[PDB]
Short mmCIF file of C-alpha atoms in Angstrom, two decimals:
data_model
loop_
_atom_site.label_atom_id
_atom_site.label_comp_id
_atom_site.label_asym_id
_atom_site.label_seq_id
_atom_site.Cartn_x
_atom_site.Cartn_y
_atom_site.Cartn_z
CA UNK A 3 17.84 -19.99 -19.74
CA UNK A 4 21.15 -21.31 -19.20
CA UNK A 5 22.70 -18.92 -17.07
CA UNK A 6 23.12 -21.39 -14.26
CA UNK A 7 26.33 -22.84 -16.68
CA UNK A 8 27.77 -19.93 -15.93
CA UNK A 9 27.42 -19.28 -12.99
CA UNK A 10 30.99 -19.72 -12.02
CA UNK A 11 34.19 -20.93 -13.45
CA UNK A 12 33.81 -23.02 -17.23
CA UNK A 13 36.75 -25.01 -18.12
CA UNK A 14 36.83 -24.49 -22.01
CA UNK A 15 38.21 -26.44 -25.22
CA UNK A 16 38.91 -24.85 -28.14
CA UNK A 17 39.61 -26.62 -32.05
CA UNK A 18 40.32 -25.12 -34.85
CA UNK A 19 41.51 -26.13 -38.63
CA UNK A 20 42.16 -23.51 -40.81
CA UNK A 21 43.68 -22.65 -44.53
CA UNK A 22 45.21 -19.90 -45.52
CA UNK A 23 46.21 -19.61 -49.13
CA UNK A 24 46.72 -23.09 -49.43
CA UNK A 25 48.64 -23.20 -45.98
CA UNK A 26 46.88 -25.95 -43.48
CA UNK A 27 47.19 -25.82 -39.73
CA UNK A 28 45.13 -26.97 -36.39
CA UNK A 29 45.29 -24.77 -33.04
CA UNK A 30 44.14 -26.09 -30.05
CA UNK A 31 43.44 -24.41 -26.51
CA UNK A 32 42.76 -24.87 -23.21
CA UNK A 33 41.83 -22.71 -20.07
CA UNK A 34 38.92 -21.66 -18.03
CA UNK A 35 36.13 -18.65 -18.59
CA UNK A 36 34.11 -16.32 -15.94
CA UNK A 37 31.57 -15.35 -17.21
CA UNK A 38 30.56 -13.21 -13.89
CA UNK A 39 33.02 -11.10 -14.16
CA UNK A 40 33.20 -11.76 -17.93
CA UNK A 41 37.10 -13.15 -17.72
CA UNK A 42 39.25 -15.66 -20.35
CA UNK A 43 42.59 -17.46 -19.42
CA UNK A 44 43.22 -19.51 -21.95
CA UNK A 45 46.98 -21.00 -23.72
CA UNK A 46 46.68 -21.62 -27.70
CA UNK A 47 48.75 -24.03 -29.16
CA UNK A 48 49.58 -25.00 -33.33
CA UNK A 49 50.12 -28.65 -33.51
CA UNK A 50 51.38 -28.44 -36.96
CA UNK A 51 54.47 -26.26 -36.64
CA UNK A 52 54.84 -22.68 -37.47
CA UNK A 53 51.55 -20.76 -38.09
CA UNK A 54 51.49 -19.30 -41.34
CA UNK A 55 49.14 -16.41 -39.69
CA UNK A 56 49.74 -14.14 -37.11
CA UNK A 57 48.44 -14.99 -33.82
CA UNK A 58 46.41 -12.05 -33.37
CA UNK A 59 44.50 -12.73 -36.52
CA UNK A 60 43.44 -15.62 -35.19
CA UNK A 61 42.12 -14.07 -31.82
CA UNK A 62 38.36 -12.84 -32.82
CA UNK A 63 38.09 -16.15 -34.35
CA UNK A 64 39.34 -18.30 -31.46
CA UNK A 66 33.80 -17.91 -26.80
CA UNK A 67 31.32 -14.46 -26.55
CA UNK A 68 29.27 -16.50 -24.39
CA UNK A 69 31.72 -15.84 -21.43
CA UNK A 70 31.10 -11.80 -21.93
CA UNK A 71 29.24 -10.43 -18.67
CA UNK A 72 26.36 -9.59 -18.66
CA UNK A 73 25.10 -6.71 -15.88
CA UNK A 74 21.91 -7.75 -14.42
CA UNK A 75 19.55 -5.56 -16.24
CA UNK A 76 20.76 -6.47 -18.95
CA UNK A 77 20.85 -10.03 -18.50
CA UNK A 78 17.85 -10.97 -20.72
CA UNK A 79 19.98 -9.30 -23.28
CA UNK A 80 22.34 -12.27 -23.13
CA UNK A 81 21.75 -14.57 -26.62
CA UNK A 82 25.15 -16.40 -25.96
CA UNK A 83 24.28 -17.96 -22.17
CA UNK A 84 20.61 -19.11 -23.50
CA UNK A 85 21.27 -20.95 -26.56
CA UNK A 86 23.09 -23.04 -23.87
CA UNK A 87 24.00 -26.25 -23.56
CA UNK A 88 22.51 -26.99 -27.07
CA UNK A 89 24.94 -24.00 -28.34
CA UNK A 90 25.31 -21.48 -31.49
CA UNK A 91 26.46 -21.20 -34.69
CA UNK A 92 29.10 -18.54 -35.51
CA UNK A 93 29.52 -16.94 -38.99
CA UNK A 94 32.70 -14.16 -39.70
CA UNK A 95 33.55 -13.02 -42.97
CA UNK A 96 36.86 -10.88 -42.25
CA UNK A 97 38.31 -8.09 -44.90
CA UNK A 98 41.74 -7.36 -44.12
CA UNK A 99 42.25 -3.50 -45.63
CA UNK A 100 44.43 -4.19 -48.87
CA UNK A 101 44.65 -7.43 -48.34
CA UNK A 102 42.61 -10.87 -48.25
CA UNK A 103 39.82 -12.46 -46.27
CA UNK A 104 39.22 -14.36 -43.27
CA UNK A 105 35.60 -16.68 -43.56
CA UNK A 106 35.16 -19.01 -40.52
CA UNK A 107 32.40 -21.49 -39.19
CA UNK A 108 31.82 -22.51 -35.19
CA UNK A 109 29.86 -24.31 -33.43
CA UNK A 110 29.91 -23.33 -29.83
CA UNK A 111 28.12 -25.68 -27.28
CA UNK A 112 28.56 -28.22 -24.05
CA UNK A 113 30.27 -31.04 -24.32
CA UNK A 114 29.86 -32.50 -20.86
CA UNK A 115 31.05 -29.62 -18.52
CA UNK A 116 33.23 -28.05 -20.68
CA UNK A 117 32.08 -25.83 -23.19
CA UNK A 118 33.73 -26.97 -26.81
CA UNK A 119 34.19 -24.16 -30.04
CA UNK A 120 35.28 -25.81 -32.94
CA UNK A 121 36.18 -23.72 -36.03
CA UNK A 122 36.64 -24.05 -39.78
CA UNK A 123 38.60 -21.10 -41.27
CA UNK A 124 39.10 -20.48 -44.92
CA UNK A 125 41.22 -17.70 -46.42
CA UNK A 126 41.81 -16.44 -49.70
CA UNK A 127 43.63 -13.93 -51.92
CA UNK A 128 45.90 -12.36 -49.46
CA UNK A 129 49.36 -11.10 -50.65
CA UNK A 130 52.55 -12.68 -49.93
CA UNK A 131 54.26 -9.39 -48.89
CA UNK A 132 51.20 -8.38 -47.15
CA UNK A 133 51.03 -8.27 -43.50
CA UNK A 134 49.32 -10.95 -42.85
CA UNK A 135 51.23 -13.74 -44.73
CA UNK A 136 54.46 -11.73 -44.35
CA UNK A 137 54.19 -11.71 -40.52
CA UNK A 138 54.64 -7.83 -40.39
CA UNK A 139 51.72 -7.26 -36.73
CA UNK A 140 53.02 -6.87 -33.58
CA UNK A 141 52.25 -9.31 -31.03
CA UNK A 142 49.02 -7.51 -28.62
CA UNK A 143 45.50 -6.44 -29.03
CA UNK A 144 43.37 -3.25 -28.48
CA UNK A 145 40.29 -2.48 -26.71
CA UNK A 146 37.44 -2.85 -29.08
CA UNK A 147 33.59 -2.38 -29.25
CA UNK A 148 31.61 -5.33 -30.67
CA UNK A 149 27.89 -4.11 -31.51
CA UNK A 150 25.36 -6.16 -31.64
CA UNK A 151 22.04 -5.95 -33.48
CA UNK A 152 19.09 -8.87 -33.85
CA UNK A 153 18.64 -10.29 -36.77
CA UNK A 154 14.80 -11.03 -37.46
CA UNK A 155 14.25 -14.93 -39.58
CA UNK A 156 17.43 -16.29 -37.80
CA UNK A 157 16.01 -16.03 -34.40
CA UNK A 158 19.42 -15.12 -33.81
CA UNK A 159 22.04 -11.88 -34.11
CA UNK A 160 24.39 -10.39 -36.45
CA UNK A 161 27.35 -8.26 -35.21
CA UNK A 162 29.78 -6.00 -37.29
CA UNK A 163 33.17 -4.20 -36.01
CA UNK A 164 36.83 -3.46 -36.88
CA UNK A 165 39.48 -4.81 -35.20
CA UNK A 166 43.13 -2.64 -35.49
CA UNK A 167 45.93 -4.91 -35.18
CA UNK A 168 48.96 -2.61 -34.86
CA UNK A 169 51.55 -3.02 -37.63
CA UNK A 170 55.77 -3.16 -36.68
CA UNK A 171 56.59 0.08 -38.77
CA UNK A 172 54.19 1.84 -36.71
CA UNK A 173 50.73 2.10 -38.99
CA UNK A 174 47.75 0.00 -38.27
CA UNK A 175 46.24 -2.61 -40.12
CA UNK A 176 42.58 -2.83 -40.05
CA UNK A 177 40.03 -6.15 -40.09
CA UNK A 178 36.09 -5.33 -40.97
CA UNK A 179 34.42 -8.17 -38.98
CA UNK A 180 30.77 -9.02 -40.25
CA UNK A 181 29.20 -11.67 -37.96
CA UNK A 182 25.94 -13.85 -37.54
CA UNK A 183 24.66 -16.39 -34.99
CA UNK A 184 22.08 -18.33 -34.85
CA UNK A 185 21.40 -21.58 -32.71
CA UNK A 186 21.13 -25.41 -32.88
CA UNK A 187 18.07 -26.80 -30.52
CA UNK A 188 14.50 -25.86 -32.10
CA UNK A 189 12.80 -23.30 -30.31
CA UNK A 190 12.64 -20.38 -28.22
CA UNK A 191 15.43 -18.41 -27.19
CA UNK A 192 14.25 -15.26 -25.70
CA UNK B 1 -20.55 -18.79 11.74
CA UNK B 2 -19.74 -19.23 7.87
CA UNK B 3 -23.91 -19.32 7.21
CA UNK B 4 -23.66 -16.80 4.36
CA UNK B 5 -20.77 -17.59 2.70
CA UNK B 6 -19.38 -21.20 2.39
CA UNK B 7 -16.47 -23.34 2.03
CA UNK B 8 -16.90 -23.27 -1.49
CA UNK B 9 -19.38 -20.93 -3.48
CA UNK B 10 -19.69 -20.46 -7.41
CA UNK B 11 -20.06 -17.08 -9.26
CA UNK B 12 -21.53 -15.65 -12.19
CA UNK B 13 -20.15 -13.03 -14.23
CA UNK B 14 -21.41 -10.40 -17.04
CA UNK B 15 -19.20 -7.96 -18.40
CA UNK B 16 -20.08 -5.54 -20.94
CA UNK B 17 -17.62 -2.68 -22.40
CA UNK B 18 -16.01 -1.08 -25.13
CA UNK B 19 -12.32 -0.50 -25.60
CA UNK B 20 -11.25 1.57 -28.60
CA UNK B 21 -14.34 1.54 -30.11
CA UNK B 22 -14.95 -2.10 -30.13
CA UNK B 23 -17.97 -3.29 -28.24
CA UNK B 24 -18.23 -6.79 -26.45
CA UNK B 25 -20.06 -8.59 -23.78
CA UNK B 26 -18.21 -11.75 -21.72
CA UNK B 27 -20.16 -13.78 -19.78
CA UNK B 28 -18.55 -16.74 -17.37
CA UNK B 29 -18.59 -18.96 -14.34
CA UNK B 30 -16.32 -19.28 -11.35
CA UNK B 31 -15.77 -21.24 -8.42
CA UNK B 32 -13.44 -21.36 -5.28
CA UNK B 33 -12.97 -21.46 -1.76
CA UNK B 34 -13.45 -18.27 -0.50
CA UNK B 35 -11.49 -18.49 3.27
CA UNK B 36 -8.45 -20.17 1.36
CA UNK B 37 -7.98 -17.58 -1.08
CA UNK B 38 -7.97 -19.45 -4.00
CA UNK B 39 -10.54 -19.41 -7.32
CA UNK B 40 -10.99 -20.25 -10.85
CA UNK B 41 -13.22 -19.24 -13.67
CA UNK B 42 -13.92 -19.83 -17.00
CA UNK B 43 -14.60 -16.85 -19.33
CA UNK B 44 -16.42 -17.11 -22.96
CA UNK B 45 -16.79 -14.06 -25.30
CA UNK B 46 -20.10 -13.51 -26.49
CA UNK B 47 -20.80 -10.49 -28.01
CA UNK B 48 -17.92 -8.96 -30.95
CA UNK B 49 -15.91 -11.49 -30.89
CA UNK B 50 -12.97 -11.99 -31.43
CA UNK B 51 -11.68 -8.86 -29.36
CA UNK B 52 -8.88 -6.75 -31.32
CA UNK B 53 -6.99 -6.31 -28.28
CA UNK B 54 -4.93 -8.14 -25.34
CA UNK B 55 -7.27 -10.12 -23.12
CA UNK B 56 -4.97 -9.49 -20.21
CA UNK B 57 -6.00 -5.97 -19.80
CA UNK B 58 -9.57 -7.57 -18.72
CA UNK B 59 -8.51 -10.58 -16.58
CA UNK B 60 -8.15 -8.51 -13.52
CA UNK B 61 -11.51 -7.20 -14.07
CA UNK B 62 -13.02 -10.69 -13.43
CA UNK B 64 -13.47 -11.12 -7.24
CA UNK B 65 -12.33 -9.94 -3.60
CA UNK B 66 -14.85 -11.95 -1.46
CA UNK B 67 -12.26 -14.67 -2.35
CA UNK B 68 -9.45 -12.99 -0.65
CA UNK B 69 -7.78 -15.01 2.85
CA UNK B 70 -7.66 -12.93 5.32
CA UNK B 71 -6.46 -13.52 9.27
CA UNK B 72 -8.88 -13.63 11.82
CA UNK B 73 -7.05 -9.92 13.34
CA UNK B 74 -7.80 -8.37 9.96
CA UNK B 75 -11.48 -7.41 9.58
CA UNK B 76 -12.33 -9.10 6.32
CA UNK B 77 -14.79 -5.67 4.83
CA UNK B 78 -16.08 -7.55 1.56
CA UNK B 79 -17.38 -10.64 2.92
CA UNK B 80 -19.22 -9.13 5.54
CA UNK B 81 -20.56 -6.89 3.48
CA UNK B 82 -23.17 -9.74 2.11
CA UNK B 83 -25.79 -11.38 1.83
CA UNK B 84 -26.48 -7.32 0.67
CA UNK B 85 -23.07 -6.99 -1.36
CA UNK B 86 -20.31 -4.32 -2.70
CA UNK B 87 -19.40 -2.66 -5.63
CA UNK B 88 -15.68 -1.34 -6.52
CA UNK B 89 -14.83 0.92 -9.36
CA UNK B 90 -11.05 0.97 -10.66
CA UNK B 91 -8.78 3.13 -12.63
CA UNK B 92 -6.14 1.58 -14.46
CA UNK B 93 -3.43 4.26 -15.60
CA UNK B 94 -0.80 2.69 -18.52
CA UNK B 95 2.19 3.92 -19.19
CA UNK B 96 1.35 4.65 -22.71
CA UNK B 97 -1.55 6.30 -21.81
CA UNK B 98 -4.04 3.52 -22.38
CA UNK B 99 -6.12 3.77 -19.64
CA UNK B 100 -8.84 1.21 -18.33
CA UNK B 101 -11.97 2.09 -16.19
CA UNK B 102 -14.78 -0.24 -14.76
CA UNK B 103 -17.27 0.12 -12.27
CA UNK B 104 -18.70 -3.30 -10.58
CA UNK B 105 -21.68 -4.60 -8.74
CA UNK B 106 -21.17 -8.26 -6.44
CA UNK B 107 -24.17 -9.59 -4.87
CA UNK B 108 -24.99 -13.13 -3.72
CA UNK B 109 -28.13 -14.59 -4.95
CA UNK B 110 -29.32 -18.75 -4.56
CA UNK B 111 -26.08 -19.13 -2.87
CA UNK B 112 -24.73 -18.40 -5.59
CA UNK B 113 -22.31 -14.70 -5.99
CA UNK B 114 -23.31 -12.37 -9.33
CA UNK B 115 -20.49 -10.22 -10.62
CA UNK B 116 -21.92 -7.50 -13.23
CA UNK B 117 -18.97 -5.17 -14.79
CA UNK B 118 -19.09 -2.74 -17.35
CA UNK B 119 -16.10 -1.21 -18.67
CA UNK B 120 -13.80 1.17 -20.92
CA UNK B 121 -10.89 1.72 -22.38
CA UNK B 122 -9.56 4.33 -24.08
CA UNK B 123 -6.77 6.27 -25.65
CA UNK B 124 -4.37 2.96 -26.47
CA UNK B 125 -1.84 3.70 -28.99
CA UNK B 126 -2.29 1.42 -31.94
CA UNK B 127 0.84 0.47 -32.38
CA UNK B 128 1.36 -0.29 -28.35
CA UNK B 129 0.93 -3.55 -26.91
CA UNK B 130 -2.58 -3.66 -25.91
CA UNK B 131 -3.77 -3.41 -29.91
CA UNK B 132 -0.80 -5.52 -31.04
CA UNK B 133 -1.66 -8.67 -28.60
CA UNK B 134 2.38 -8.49 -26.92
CA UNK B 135 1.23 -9.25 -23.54
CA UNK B 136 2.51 -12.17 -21.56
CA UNK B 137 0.04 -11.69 -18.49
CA UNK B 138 0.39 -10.38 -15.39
CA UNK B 139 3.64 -10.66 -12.63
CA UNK B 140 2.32 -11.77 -9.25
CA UNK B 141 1.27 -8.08 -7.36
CA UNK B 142 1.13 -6.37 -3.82
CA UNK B 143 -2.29 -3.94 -3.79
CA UNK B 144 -2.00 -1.80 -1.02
CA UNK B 145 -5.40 -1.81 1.30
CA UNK B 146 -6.32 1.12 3.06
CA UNK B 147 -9.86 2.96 4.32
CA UNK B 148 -10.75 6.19 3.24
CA UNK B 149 -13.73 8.18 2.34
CA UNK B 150 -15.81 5.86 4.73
CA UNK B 151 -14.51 3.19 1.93
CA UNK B 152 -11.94 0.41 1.43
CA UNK B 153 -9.50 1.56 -1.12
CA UNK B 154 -6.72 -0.42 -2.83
CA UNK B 155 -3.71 0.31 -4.92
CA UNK B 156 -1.43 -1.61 -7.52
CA UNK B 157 1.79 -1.01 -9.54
CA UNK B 158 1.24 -3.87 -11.52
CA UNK B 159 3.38 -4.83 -14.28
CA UNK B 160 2.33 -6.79 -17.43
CA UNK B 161 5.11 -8.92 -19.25
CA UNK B 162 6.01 -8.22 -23.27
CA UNK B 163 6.28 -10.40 -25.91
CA UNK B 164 9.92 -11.87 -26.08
CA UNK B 165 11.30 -9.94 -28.90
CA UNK B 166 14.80 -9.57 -29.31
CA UNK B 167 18.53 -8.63 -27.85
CA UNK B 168 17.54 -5.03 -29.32
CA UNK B 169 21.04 -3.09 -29.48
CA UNK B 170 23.71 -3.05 -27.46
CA UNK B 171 27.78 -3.47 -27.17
CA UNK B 172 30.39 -5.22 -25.89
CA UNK B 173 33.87 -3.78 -24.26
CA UNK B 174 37.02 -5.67 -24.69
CA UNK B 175 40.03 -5.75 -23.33
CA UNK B 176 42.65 -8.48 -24.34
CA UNK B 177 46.75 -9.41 -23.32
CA UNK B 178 48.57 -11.51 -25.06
CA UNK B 179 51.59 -13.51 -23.85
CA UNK B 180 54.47 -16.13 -24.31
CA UNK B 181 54.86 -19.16 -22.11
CA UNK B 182 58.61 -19.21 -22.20
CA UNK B 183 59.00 -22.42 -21.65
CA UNK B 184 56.53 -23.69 -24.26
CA UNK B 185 58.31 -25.59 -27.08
CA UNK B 186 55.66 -25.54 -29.27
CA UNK B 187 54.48 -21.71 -31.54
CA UNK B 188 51.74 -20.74 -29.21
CA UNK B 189 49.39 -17.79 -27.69
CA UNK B 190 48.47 -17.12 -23.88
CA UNK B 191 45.73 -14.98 -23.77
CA UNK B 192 43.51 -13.20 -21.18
CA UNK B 193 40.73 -11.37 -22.30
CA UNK B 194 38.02 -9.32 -20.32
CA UNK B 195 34.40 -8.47 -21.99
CA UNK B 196 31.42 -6.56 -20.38
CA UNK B 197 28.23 -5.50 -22.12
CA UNK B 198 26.67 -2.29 -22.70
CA UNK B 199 24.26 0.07 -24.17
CA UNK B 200 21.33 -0.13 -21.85
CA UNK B 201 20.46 1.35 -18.60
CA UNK B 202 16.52 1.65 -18.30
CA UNK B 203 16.56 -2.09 -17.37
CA UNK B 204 13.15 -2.16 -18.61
CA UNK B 205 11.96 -3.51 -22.08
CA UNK B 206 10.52 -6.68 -20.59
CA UNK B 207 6.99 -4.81 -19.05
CA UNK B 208 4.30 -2.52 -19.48
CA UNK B 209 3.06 -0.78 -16.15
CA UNK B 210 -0.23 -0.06 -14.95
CA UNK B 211 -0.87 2.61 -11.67
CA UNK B 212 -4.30 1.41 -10.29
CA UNK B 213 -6.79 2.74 -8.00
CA UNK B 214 -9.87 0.66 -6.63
CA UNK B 215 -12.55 1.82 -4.58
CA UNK B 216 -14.44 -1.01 -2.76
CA UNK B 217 -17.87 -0.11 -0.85
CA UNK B 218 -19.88 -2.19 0.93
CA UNK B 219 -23.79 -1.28 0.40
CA UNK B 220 -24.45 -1.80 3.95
CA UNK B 221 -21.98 0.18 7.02
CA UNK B 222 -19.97 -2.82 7.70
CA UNK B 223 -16.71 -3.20 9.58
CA UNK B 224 -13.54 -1.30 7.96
CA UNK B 225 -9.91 -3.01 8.47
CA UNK B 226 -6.59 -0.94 9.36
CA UNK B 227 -4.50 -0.73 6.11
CA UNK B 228 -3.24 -3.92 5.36
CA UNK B 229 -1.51 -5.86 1.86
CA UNK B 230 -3.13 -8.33 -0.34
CA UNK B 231 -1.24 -10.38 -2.23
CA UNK B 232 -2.36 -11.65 -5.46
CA UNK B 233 -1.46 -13.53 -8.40
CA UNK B 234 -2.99 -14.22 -12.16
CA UNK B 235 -2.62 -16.93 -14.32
CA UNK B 236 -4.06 -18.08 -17.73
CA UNK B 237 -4.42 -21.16 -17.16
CA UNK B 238 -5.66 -21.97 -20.77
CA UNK B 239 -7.55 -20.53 -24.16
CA UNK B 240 -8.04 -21.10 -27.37
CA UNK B 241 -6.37 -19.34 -30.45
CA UNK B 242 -8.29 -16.17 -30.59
CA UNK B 243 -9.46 -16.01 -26.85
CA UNK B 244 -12.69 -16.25 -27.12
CA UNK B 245 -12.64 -19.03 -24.74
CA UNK B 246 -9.97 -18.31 -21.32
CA UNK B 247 -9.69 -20.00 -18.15
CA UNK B 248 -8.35 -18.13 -15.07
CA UNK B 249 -6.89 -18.81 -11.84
CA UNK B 250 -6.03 -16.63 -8.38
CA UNK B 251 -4.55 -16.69 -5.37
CA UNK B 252 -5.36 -13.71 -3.21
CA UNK B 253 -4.24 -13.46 0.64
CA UNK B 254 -4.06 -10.66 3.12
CA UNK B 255 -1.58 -10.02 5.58
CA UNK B 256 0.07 -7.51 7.83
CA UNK B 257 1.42 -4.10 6.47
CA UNK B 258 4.51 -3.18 8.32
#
């Protein structure tokens, strides 16, 4: 099961090293999830001086398991019951006319806070281009993440595209093309 | 005066039926305590083996003299021996799959002898019956009522699926992002709100069954006020193809209202 974790308030830790054309940098976070009424607070922080990315690139990559879930459709939930032994999170990320995101995380419980610890990798993205030229505004959008179950994983796979609003007024789009799968043996239901 | 049946008695059963076209005869043994509500049995296939379809559709089909019952509620089966009962059931699925047997319980060498003969017909082949995605049976209410100069009974019961997947659904998000303004360091706040949906019906998880049971005793014997059993199933073991199943129930009556 797992949904007894989240039953209320989940302090939550949050790692990630990334690089980005050849640019290195580590973020690290800190705050507390709800996952009854499916909230995040949480403060991000790059150890390693400026970030070479724009913060909201970062944000789809930097805790689903937090989403909540109504009570019908709580046997839905794959996040909550892979819990405490946690999942593994695959993104590959196309950035329209420019490069590509690719990230591993491995979300679980370490002791009563619940630990995601990234690895990002990007590649071929230009240096004029919004991304590495710092050209996005700093917010989000609303967004629909659908998920579908992928068969031999025992796990899901998720696509969507995230529109990160661009300074000069146009929109800059990111493809998002995600698996899961988890880490303990066995069922998951 | 508990001279007919005991503390304990032991049953015999023989069923013999067909369910999409498939012939089969089961023959078991049982035992239990009768006043406590409680019994077990163990079931071995012996005719057209193994059976195509979901054994759970003909657990239920396998004992109301072992119902508890309180001393203000007329218990109708067990005084309706040494002579006996029969009851015949209809089992309506939602799929249309629909189950029908027709019983005979009499007690002979102290000993109780179940004979059942049943059908089923109209499952969908692809539905869960014929594809073995049964989990067994959720714990159940039947309602208890006399009519017809007969006890009658009645069950929404609900059979558990297969775990299969998440299916399809979708999650909304909503997400702010902020500046501490004191923070030295380049940095994010963020606070982000996520709800799923997609799905309404609630229910992927069970297969429903509407079912009717007559009871009659073969001798006029006292008829209780309508009244609720409560009952619950459990395989208690088997082996790979269920040719061999063990069963356990706990059955007690009580007050309607």
């Amino acid at each position: 099961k797992g949904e007894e974790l989240f039953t209320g308030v989940v302090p939550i830790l949050i790692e990630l090293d990334g690089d980005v054309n050849g640019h290195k940098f580590f973020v690290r976070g800190e705050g507390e999830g709800d996952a009854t009424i499916g909230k995040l607070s949480l403060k991000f922080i790059c150890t390693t001086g400026k970030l070479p990315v724009p913060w909201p690139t970062l944000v789809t990559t930097l805790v689903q398991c937090f989403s909540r879930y109504p009570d019908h459709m709580k046997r839905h939930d794959f996040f909550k019951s892979a819990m405490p032994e946690g999942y593994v999170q695959e993104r590959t990320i196309y950035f329209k006319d420019d490069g590509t995101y690719k990230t591993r995380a491995e979300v679980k419980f370490e002791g009563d806070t619940l630990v995601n610890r990234i690895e990002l990798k990007g590649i071929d993205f230009k240096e004029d281009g919004n991304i590495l030229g710092h050209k996005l505004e700093y917010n989000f959008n609303s967004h629909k993440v659908y998920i579908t179950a992928d068969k031999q994983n025992n796990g899901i796979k998720a696509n969507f595209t995230i529109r990160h609003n661009v300074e000069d007024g146009s929109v800059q789009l990111a493809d998002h093309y995600q698996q899961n799968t988890p880490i303990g043996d066995g069922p998951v239901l | 005066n508990m001279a007919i049946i005991k503390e304990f008695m032991r049953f015999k059963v023989h069923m013999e039926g067909s369910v999409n076209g498939h012939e089969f005869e089961i023959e078991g043994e049982g035992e239990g305590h009768p006043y406590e509500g409680t019994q077990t049995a163990k079931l071995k296939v012996t005719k057209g083996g193994p059976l195509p379809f979901a054994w759970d559709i003909l657990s239920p089909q396998f004992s109301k003299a072992y119902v508890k019952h309180p001393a203000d509620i007329p218990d109708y089966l067990k005084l309706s021996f040494p002579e006996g009962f029969t009851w015949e059931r209809v089992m309506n699925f939602e799929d249309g799959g629909v189950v029908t047997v027709t019983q005979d319980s009499s007690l002979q060498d102290g000993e109780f002898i179940y004979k059942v003969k049943l059908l089923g017909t109209n499952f969908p082949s692809d539905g869960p019956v014929m594809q073995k995605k049964t989990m067994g049976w959720e714990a159940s209410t039947e309602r208890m009522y006399p009519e017809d100069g007969a006890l009658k009974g009645e069950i929404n019961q609900r059979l558990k699926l297969k775990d299969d997947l998440p299916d399809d659904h979708y999650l909304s998000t909503q997400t702010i992002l902020s500046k501490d303004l004191n923070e030295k360091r380049d940095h994010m706040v963020l606070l982000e709100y996520v709800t799923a949906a997609g799905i309404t019906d609630a229910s992927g998880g069970h297969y429903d069954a509407e079912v009717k049971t007559t009871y009659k005793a073969k001798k006029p014997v006292q008829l209780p006020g309508a009244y609720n059993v409560d009952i619950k199933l459990d395989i208690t073991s088997h082996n790979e193809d269920y040719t061999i199943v063990e069963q356990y129930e706990r059955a007690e009556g009580r007050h309607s209202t």
